[PDB]
Amino acid sequence: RTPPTKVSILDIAGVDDTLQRLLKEVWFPLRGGEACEKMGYRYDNGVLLHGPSGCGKTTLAHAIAGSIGVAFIPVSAPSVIGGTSGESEKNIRDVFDEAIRLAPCLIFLDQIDAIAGRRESANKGMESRIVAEIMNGMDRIRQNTPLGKNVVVLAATNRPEFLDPAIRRRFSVEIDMGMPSERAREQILRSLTRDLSLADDINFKELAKMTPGYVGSDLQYVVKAAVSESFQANIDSLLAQARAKHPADHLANVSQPQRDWLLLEAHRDEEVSWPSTKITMEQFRKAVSLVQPASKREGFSTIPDTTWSHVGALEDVRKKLEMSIIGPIKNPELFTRVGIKPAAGILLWGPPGCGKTLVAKAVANESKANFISIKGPELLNKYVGESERAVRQLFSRAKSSAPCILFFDQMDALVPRRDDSLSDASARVVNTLLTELDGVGDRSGIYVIGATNRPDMIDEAIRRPGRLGTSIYVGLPSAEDRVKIL
Amino acid sequence: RTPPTKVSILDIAGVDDTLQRLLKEVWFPLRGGEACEKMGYRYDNGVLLHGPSGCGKTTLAHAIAGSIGVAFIPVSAPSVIGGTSGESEKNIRDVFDEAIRLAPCLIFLDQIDAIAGRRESANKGMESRIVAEIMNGMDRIRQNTPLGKNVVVLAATNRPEFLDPAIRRRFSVEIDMGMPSERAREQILRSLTRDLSLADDINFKELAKMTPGYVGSDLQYVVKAAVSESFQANIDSLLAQARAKHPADHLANVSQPQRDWLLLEAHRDEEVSWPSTKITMEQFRKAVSLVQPASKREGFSTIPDTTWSHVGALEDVRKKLEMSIIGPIKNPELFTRVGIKPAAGILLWGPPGCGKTLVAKAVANESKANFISIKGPELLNKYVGESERAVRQLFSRAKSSAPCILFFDQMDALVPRRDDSLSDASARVVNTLLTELDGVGDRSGIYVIGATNRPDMIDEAIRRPGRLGTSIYVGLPSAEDRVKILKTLYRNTVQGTTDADLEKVALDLRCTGFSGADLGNLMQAAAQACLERVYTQRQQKRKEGEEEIEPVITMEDWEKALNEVKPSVKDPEKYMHS
Ligand SMILES: Nc1ncnc2c1ncn2[C@@H]1O[C@H](COP(=O)(O)OP(=O)(O)OP(=O)(O)O)[C@@H](O)[C@H]1O
Ligand SMILES: Nc1ncnc2c1ncn2[C@@H]1O[C@H](COP(=O)(O)OP(=O)(O)OP(=O)(O)O)[C@@H](O)[C@H]1O
Ligand SMILES: Nc1ncnc2c1ncn2[C@@H]1O[C@H](COP(=O)(O)OP(=O)(O)OP(=O)(O)O)[C@@H](O)[C@H]1O
Ligand SMILES: Nc1ncnc2c1ncn2[C@@H]1O[C@H](COP(=O)(O)OP(=O)(O)OP(=O)(O)O)[C@@H](O)[C@H]1O
């Protein structure tokens, strides 16, 4: 026998539309069993949950089980596999047999790509046999159903492409647990904070606003990070206290971390009372700085200490830049009300060493937004199909986490190979680039900045509005400006 | 002992020709056993059923067993495998032994590729041994047959290529359970609806007509979807009822889904009576929209909210497009009667940012048909045999589900590498493409649209009729058109609309030498200048003197923006001549 678990339903939020759909599909067959039997009509059998890792797929399933109050049978990816070639199949049968016998129940298949991958990618005679066992089980359920058997099969996967097209057909209902919004993040923050004693200066709304590409798991961690930051006061207190009980003069010290460690080791059986302190908004900001956006292993470059005070003159350019980049990031409300779409990109052109690279970083800094710098030919490969795939990947990464400034330094290499027929590799790359800039999808938050020391040989197609339309000239010929720089 | 099951024979339909053949081959040996024994003539032993998953292979077998009334022995793929190396073989023997002893019977081998795959692909000593056991069993049946033994071996598989050529030879009769037609779908719908109380407004014929690439399993689901949609009224009723029994004020709510859940949890042992309601045609349409064609894994790019109202002018082009794409999709009757074959493809060529990509989407939307967009080089791999295989796969997917528009953006890359000998990889891909277009696979429903900013270097072979013959030029040089575009852009704002201002702006010399992209930029520039005015004025007044924000845009803003902005495209001679 396997009874349900006690998990908090008030923990998951930001999934309003999806949870509603799930409720509709699952509530009627499980709760009103007598009604469905009398009518004779057939219902939903399989529900597949997809999306990235840590999106709360496992939690959602657990929550749903507890909330409804039905029997939960957890089937993890390697829990059914045995030692001998036959025990694995026997177990699958027993699972389905006990499940159909006892009702109402929820069978949860966590991480299904490990059990049922594509049968062409699996050259083993055991793996193909397991897929077959699952298929047989599915059919048995369908036949037994009109009597009084009520079982819904839930499943969770991280990638739909790895799954066998055959099982995809068997499953009917699909729910996409993707990326959260401003409102959604706010809700998630509230769910996590629920057990904590927050101070009056904390505005969860402000946190959510200034939290771009963070997921449910990331926000969970930000909360945990804040907890550790607050308890630093208690550490300092203990250090001072320890140095008074056991002085040890200057024999216990060679460095700072080592001395602290030694004092604690000496104490051992000393129990201390910890006061319950409240968290500040400053502590949260500190916690946020030290957190990774889950997609840290990327082309993510940190913003330098470059401000407007480092740039002498160019006040006109500064204002123009503020309008384009800082305008949409800081004031989305203003842009939506007036009626215009947010910017796409700008081009910095002129003589070498005039501050083009600095300006790009400076703007990114000011906006407190992310910055990625791809210089010259750091894209091209020796192979016929990795360069284009890589460019696609960059835009995908950018789309996932916004606000970000995408900087392209020295574009004089890639762009002129269009007007005159030369190479085939160069042709493909530039065409993919044009496509990524102007084509299907590619929303705002991502502002592309291009820079070149040579504006001469460049294709007009790239210059066209919607791609890189705002041509900003960076030059230096005046006296007043020079004094400011000095 | 294993007696037959009670499955509905009135559930499967659309398999008229195939079911007839099956009946002929299976009826005589099973039903008239005395007659065959007397004659001394030999009959059919093995019947193999093939086709895609969920095609009703298992059901057909079950149905046939029940209908005839013979003994059913179900042999599933892993049901015979044991623990020790010998039990598996012993079981296979016992199955065949009991089967020959008791007659008339139907042995059904469900999913056979898991038991008997190619012996070269199986490096295990057990798998090869199992194939041998099956072969031995087959021979034993043949020898025993002239006495009074009547057993027919049915089998189901999803792929014929994975099966061992040896067993293929052993099996004599083969039935292909493929895809349905308009008439067939109608029949399937009726089979499923049989137990439901349909309303008078429901026309199953209309549903079937507007259901392109759906299979037996898909239609089954559409019916189930409708059931769930109807029972939403009961959910609303329960919600209102619950909030009256247990109010809980405003403590039970943080959001909407959570509050609903909590109320139900509180009730538990409360039984409610559900009224039997009828379904509407509207509910079916809603259900259809939310369903997947089981081939959603493909690369199903959804159609945007782009209509003809979003495109300023180009009325001539609009009509031409309607003729070619909407003509065959909406009116197949017209085309069959006149005598012409449906279209294959069109080419959109001209200056950048003139609405080529938009047009493609717009047409797809209008037809309510599917849309796939492959841009530049999203096909090529680093390996020597995946690029060509992928292209083949795209056409296969398109063939399976039609109506669909296949869009190729920026063809200037793939096409010119023919006229001059350069790369080998590029050569193979383009040749495969030409083959897919003209070869044998172009059975309509699939309309290919190509777009290029550079019509110059392209191979004439691709341009040839039957492939991409309809060359449509997308350009922009007139006053009336510009006014329409300006109105279209300034249409999407939400008081002050001002029509006179728009016309005057168009008249100016600077505006004459512009394009669609330029006009869009001008609009944005004007908006930015207006914001500057609002910010400077508001801040000065608020600090010295909180007031209201004014989003209004006048002519002074337009004039200043107009003065500064310069055009993008310079020489039109390049595009026109080449
Ligand atoms: N949407 C969310 N709301 C609140 N908490 C979340 C959310 N997503 C994840 N978490 C936190 O992160 C943890 C991981 O969730 P879970 O394991 O369900 O994610 P997952 O998508 O199933 O990951 P995987 O599929 O890789 O196992 C949870 O225990 C929860 O505390
Ligand atoms: N206005 C400026 N203020 C401060 N430093 C400057 C300025 N202009 C140029 N420099 C110096 O020149 C260097 C290069 O600046 P940057 O790279 O931004 O110029 P550029 O126009 O991109 O030309 P290039 O990168 O080709 O030298 C910087 O390290 C900086 O110290
Ligand atoms: N042609 C059809 N007509 C009516 N219903 C069908 C048809 N095909 C499938 N179904 C429905 O879908 C279910 C699945 O059918 P079945 O399992 O026989 O398909 P299959 O081709 O054997 O799949 P697999 O071979 O992968 O097991 C049936 O129980 C039936 O209700
Ligand atoms: N007639 C038009 N109506 C509305 N928008 C237009 C029009 N022409 C161009 N545009 C704008 O230009 C952008 C690009 O349009 P589209 O991609 O269809 O042009 P194209 O001819 O394919 O050239 P490219 O894609 O190379 O810029 C769109 O986002 C759209 O806002």
Residue numbers in the entry:
A (entry chain D): 193 to 678
B (entry chain C): 193 to 686, 712 to 762, 768 to 800
Question: Can you quote the paper on this entry?
Answer:
Rix7 is a type II AAA-ATPase, composed of a unique NTD followed by tandem well conserved AAA modules known as the D1 and D2 domains respectively. In summary, our work establishes Rix7 as a nucleolar molecular unfoldase that utilizes the D1 and D2 AAA domains to thread substrates through its central pore via a processive hand-over-hand mechanism.
To determine the full-length structure, we utilized single particle cryo-EM to obtain an electron scattering map of a Chaetomium thermophilum Rix7 double Walker B mutant (CT Rix7E303Q/E602Q) and derived a structural model of the hexamer. The EM data were classified and refined without imposing symmetry which resulted in one dominant conformation at 4.5 Å resolution, that contained well resolved density for all 12 AAA domains. The cryo-EM reconstruction lacks density for the entire NTD of Rix7 (amino acids 1-192), suggesting that this domain is flexible and dynamic. There is sufficient density within the pore to accommodate a ~20 residue unfolded peptide spanning the entire 80 Å length of the pore across the D1 and D2 domains. Five of the six protomers (P1–P5) within both the D1 and D2 domains grip the polypeptide through their pore loops, while P6 does not contact the peptide. The Rix7 cryo-EM structure reveals that even in the absence of the aromatic-hydrophobic-glycine motif, PL-I within the D1 domain of Rix7 (h-S-G, where h is a hydrophobic residue) grips the polypeptide. We defined the P6 protomer as the seam subunit because it does not contact the polypeptide or closely pack with the neighboring AAA domain thereby creating a seam or break in the hexameric ring. In the D1 AAA domain, ATP is present in the nucleotide pockets of all six protomers, whereas only four nucleotides were observed in the nucleotide binding pockets of P1-P4 from the D2 AAA domain.
